[PDB]
Design a protein around this nucleic acid. Structure first.
Ligand SMILES: [K+]
Ligand SMILES: [Mg+2]
Ligand SMILES: [Mg+2]
Ligand SMILES: [Mg+2]
Ligand SMILES: [Mg+2]
Ligand SMILES: [Mg+2]
Ligand SMILES: [Mg+2]
Ligand SMILES: [Mg+2]
Ligand SMILES: [Mg+2]
Ligand SMILES: [Mg+2]
Ligand SMILES: [Mg+2]
Ligand SMILES: [Mg+2]
Ligand SMILES: [Mg+2]
Ligand SMILES: [Mg+2]
Ligand SMILES: [Mg+2]
Ligand SMILES: [Mg+2]
Ligand SMILES: [Mg+2]
Ligand SMILES: [Mg+2]
Ligand SMILES: [Mg+2]
Ligand SMILES: [Mg+2]
Ligand SMILES: [Mg+2]
Ligand SMILES: [Mg+2]
Ligand SMILES: [Mg+2]
Ligand SMILES: [Mg+2]
Ligand SMILES: [Mg+2]
Ligand SMILES: [Mg+2]
Ligand SMILES: [Mg+2]
Ligand SMILES: [Mg+2]
Ligand SMILES: [Mg+2]
Ligand code: NA
Ligand code: NA
Ligand code: NA
Ligand code: NA
Ligand code: NA
Lengths: 117, 57, 113, 126
RNA sequence: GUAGGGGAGCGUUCAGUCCGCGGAGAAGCCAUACCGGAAGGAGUGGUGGAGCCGACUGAAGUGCGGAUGCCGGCAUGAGUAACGAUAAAAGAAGUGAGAAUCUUCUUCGCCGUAAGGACAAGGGUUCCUGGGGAAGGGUCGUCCGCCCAGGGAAAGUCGG
RNA sequence: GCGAGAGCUAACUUCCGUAGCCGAGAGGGAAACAACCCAGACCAUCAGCUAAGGUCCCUAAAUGAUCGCUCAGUGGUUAA
RNA sequence: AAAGGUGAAAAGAACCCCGGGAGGGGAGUGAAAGAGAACCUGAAACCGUGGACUUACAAGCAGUCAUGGCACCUUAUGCG
């Protein structure tokens, strides 16, 4: 008994191709180039899952030291002034606090200075 | 053949090239004799006039 | 540059046999249609030819016969046409452009007296 | 409604103002060049331009324009003083492959394209 | 985690068996944001116009991006190079749905120990007449050595 | 890298001994960079601590503290 | 070498419209013309028309991640 490859290769291929959306060129229309894009695509996806965390952390920091600086301190001094006191252990989300509620974050700064010198 | 191209050209490029291929529409006039549209500084191919009538209808 | 003075379409004997053939033709038929360029080229040649023939002296005739190798026509221009064109400064030839063509897509025109 | 069968016998499906010249011995691209000038404009104007455009696709494009008008007027009973080229376009037809002898023994293949010039007219509607 | 070894499965065709679906419509194709750990599977809609899922089991022409792979179709080079000897041609008139390209006329030009004429070899209706304009014709074509029908080829002594 | 031969105590040289890595090893650092330094990726996360390295700006992080050096742009190519 | 397929059966389009034609639009036959005779299905490359969101100081393996704007809400008004 024979067994053509009928319908199989079409579906596989279509699954691949349907992945290609904002895909410029023949990346989105010719199978091979599509699949091939999908390799390096893998690479980027997987690494970016890990990377996005680095990114965000950086973001939050970049805000936090700004807040710090708005009063007369910095990020080093500020976080450190929450380490000396087991009191404040926010760390995460702090950026949102310096971005939305200024007064609160002022209070935190004042606390940091008070738990240092 | 020395005059060979490296890669095949993209739809995109190959069309940008053609962005200078649009024919100009003949600016036509209204003939003051047989109300037919004709070509400026030429003879109305319809009635045959051009200040009085020259060609055979 | 290229600031000369005439047209050419072929060689040297050509533009001649042309201007002659066409001059003869027009003189004989009084109006012909041809390519707007060929027309433009013919205008002054033929105008000038009327002015030669427009003299009456056997000389003027024998001059005209150098171009018009057709006797009936030389007689025509000489004794009929020239005479008639006696009072008008110079040159009664005009060109009317018809329109584009199908064979080659070339704008045609009518030259006439 | 019903289902997919009944709708078939209850409606025949008409094409208001539609003409097609299929298989025209010309390459689509040129004819595109000609059509482009009529894209969405008075049918009168249309007829007038085709009469002066020095291209030869002009002819068949014209013939089809007219056939459309003819349809809208006799089969669709429209008002010709309000007619215009709603939409028009040229698709490639089958191709004429010809074997053209080249130098040194090798041969090539000339590709003689055809065309399905279609054009569809319509009342302006303000 | 490469060569490599081991394990569990998906998918396809055929076969047996069982449960079945199908004109109010199968398979196939087309769309989709749902499900599964993967191979994949399903719902709905569109197209279609006859047949075909699921489960279990058996057997294989069983899974493709590559091999300057094979077949086929369609692209790029691009409206580019070319249109096949540098013996140019012009006007009028006619026909025609449409003429630079066909017909006629009057000129012009080119071969003329040929680019004239007559035979052999070879090609086989290409001849003649009247039609035809799909393809062939390196452009058009109303014309053609192309298409169609009809006709034409005559030996006692010229060839055998 | 170390310990030798060969080679001019030359070569991204060659030939042996031994350790590590690459080969089949992602990630961080060294601008970029197989090997070097730090570290061995089961999967998910808008969580936290560190290593090698750094903390003016272009990327995250003290234009940080105290005591010295260097008038050179040395740092940011070499010797008698 | 390659080349299969109208429909149950030709009833396979009388007539009219554009056109020399080819081709097409009506009408009628038929369950169906979304079967029309270079007619079962009609995938992909490839060509084109319409629409939405976009693009004429930036260096682009053509992605990936994150955010914003705009648009649409048939597994689907908050998830996308
Ligand atoms: K017909
Ligand atoms: Mg981390
Ligand atoms: Mg000479
Ligand atoms: Mg009915
Ligand atoms: Mg049936
Ligand atoms: Mg096999
Ligand atoms: Mg291949
Ligand atoms: Mg190559
Ligand atoms: Mg091929
Ligand atoms: Mg050009
Ligand atoms: Mg070029
Ligand atoms: Mg050029
Ligand atoms: Mg050329
Ligand atoms: Mg040549
Ligand atoms: Mg030539
Ligand atoms: Mg010629
Ligand atoms: Mg001689
Ligand atoms: Mg014979
Ligand atoms: Mg003959
Ligand atoms: Mg023909
Ligand atoms: Mg031809
Ligand atoms: Mg005999
Ligand atoms: Mg070595
Ligand atoms: Mg190896
Ligand atoms: Mg880096
Ligand atoms: Mg820390
Ligand atoms: Mg440290
Ligand atoms: Mg910083
Ligand atoms: Mg220096
Ligand atoms: Na000359
Ligand atoms: Na599916
Ligand atoms: Na290793
Ligand atoms: Na370096
Ligand atoms: Na578009």
């Amino acid at each position: 008994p024979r067994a053509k490859t009928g319908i199989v290769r079409r579906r596989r291929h279509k699954k691949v191709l349907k992945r290609a959306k904002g895909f410029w060129g023949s990346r989105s229309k010719q199978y091979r180039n599509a699949f091939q894009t999908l390799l390096n695509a893998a690479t980027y996806e997987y690494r970016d899952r890990r990377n996005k965390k680095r990114d965000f952390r950086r973001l939050w920091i970049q805000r936090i030291n700004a807040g710090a600086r708005l009063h007369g301190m910095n990020y080093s001094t500020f976080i450190n002034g929450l380490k000396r006191a087991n009191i404040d252990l926010n760390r995460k989300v702090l950026a949102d606090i310096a971005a939305r509620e200024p007064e609160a974050f002022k209070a935190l700064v004042d606390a940091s200075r008070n738990a240092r010198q | 053949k020395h005059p060979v191209p490296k890669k095949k050209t993209s739809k995109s490029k190959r069309d940008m090239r053609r962005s200078h291929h649009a024919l100009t529409a003949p600016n036509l006039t209204e003939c003051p004799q047989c109300h037919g549209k004709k070509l400026s500084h030429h003879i109305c191919p319809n009635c045959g006039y051009y200040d009085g009538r020259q060609v055979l209808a | 540059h290229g600031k000369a003075g005439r047209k050419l379409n072929r060689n040297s004997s050509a533009r001649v046999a042309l201007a002659r053939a066409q001059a003869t033709a027009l003189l004989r038929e009084g109006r012909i249609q041809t390519t707007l360029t060929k027309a433009k080229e013919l205008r002054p040649f033929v105008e000038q030819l009327i002015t030669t023939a427009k003299g009456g002296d056997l000389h003027s005739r024998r001059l005209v016969a150098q171009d018009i190798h057709d006797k009936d026509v030389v007689r025509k221009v000489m004794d009929e046409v020239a005479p008639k064109y006696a009072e008008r400064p110079g040159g009664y030839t005009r060109i009317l452009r018809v329109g584009t063509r199908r064979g080659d897509g070339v704008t045609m025109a009518l030259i006439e007296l | 409604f019903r289902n997919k069968k009944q709708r078939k016998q209850q409606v025949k499906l008409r094409k208001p103002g539609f003409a097609v010249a299929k298989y025209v011995r010309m390459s689509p691209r040129k004819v595109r060049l000609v059509v482009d000038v009529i894209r969405g404009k008075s049918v009168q104007d249309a007829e007038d331009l085709l009469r002066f455009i020095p291209r030869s696709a002009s002819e068949p494009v014209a013939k089809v324009l007219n056939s459309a008008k003819a349809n809208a007027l006799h089969n669709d009973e429209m008002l010709e003083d309000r007619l215009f080229v709603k939409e028009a376009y040229v698709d490639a037809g089958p191709t004429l492959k010809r074997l053209i002898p080249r130098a040194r023994g090798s041969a090539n293949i000339i590709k003689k394209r055809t065309s399905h010039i279609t054009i569809i007219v319509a009342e302006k509607g303000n």
